[model samples]
Target: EVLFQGPMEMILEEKDASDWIYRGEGGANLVLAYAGSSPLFVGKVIRIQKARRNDKNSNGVVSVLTSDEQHLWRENNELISSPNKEVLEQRYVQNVIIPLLGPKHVDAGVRVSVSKEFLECVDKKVTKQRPLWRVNAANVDTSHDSALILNDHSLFDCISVEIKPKCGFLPTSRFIGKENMLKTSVSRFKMHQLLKLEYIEISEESEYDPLDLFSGSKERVLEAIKALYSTPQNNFRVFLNGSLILGGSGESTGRTSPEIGYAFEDALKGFIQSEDGHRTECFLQLVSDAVYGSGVLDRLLEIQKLDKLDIEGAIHCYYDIINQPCPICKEELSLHALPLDESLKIVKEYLIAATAKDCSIMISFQSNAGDYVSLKPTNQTFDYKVHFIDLSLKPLKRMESYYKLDKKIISFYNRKQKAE
Candidate 1:
């Protein structure tokens, strides 16, 4: 029922279902809704695997470099570059991307009470028949208030964004794709019963330099961190792995838009105790350096603008093949393990960062039957759950009420875990 991958603005690659509900949002050109106790998935950030479908014609020599570069990219796509496209993608996702998204992955905090025009517009711009992942202004006609929020590898490459008030996520959808991962979590909210939200826009200037964020030398890297270090307010919150490194400086420090650079000095102090504590903060800064310091995001943004719908999946595909062996050969691809790990770390950092910046909520359940809905990642509680497990074309094909079925399966797993 879900057509995913191809060119879509927001893609739902539900690997949790073992490839069950894989579908595209805009590219597929479908309007969707979630009603009742079942949790509604507004959208998701998907990394489209980089693969070359066309090998029809190429000057053999160029293709050779293209193939080697592609393989090299796929294999070591996660490594630090002199800090090129690969480095930028890997770093931003690690440092900024993961922090923004969260450890529990899924699109959450989407303003659900929005109108059809805004939703339809977002879907249109995200999907549209296209190449790479380019966002056409023509297709998107919504105001900044109606924009979708994202913090994925895709943001590294392009300047497409419309910031909104940030919000918390549904906990039930937080579980990774695995056996019996369904249990609803209540969402936190303001006293008025509205999701708390926030705003952040990518650097408005399209042309950017990673070097601007990361100077080649470590000394330069430290300087950049310092400049970015001091700035903050109610308007924005900066974090590293769920820890707020910067906030409310406009009044507290009496400096509006404080400098971002810092030496990760011993002089620095944290308001809240972080699990990783100071070391984690330093490490987060290093990862951040790899991103902003390296000047990688600039190249990435360019690649994104070249994409068809400019969905995050296209970036996934791009990074997966940026320096790959061939646009056509998967068996020949490989990468360095350390760089790969750091690359993943960077994405993870960003997801955590973004989530902390946006997440705040409260969930109330009057009865087990009560349910909530959100595009933001929160907790899930299912009562009248429904889904299609096994579909058959035959007359009156067996359709197990998925929501009910989910509870039974989950119950079995819980007992099994307890037994174990």
Candidate 2:
């Protein structure tokens, strides 16, 4: 076998598709990890777009940006002219987000041409592995001519934790009205958890609070990590050498039980040197130390703070962008305003903040001495790397839904408070 080195342009065909195995997927994309020995792709994962099964545009050709989207991203002509969603997202992370987030932990990924046959082959191969709901909702968009190739952060014979920490802080904008004053004190994740429970979206509220994780206090950060370990919802996942060891694949898992804890404790045997009952604690402390020591959340919190006005005020600006009488302001003159350019800027920044709010952080650690942080209590040293993932671009058109959801969350929290 000849191992090619250096940057070589490559295209994936049907034969190549077999080596790419199912990893996991989110709402918009399917990710496959390479299993072949090819040096060019050994530690790479490819992301492919998925289209709704009943979508009218499901015939291979992805819908280009709408006129409003073009205007929203007008500053980036490359993004505006993207022929498909994949390119748009790549450009979005590269041009818009990286500047704000810094490039250290972000990999926008490289685009590689992929054949329709390769995509169709992957769709058939991974169908059984996919969640039934996911299968029912969408399938691979085989019409896509390219896919994004990224370094497989789950590999390198290390343990990795992927956490989707939602908005870390409560809104403090003066734009918040008396009716929604509770938003200032209660985190949106907590309020939304109640709503999820009511709708039976989640079996129970998650114990994890983003505030504790982002608090910069070592004790509170450990507390937050412990809570995530307790719940292990979609927010927290653990992978060992590219295989899921704990947490859900692509859904919210039930609360941790003795069986799960024991199994996970067994899984951490070599990585954590502590005894049976104490290994979970040490492992979590390791994760907490890496997170707190890195100070990554501090930067993320600042970006999330870009939602300065809260949706309550941003909604009015949204109406301005669409040239509509504010439905909320019909409810807001009673409330507030921006010029066109000003409105566009406000809405754009709000969406950027939305991306930050929904993104996940992946931290991978290996038992090596270099580039390491020492675990205080356990007295262990390990190398670690942190990367951000799931930084998708929010559609400008989602402003309406954003407003409605914000209203619903506040109203539901208020109603629940009264009942209590």
Top-TM-score candidate index: 2
State candidate 1's TM-score: 0.22
TM-score of model 2 relative to the true fold? 0.94
Candidate 2 residue pairs in backbone clash: 60-143, 328-332, 329-332, 332-335
TM-scores across all candidates?
A: 0.22, 0.94
lDDT of 1 by residue, 216-290 (tens): 455544443433333222322343322234432111122223133332322233321233235324533433333
The global C-alpha lDDT for each of the candidates, from Candidate 1 onward, is 0.28, 0.87
Error of 1 at 16 (Å): 24
After best superposition, candidate 2 residue 73: deviation in angstroms?
Answer: 1.6
**lDDT at 293, model 2:** 83
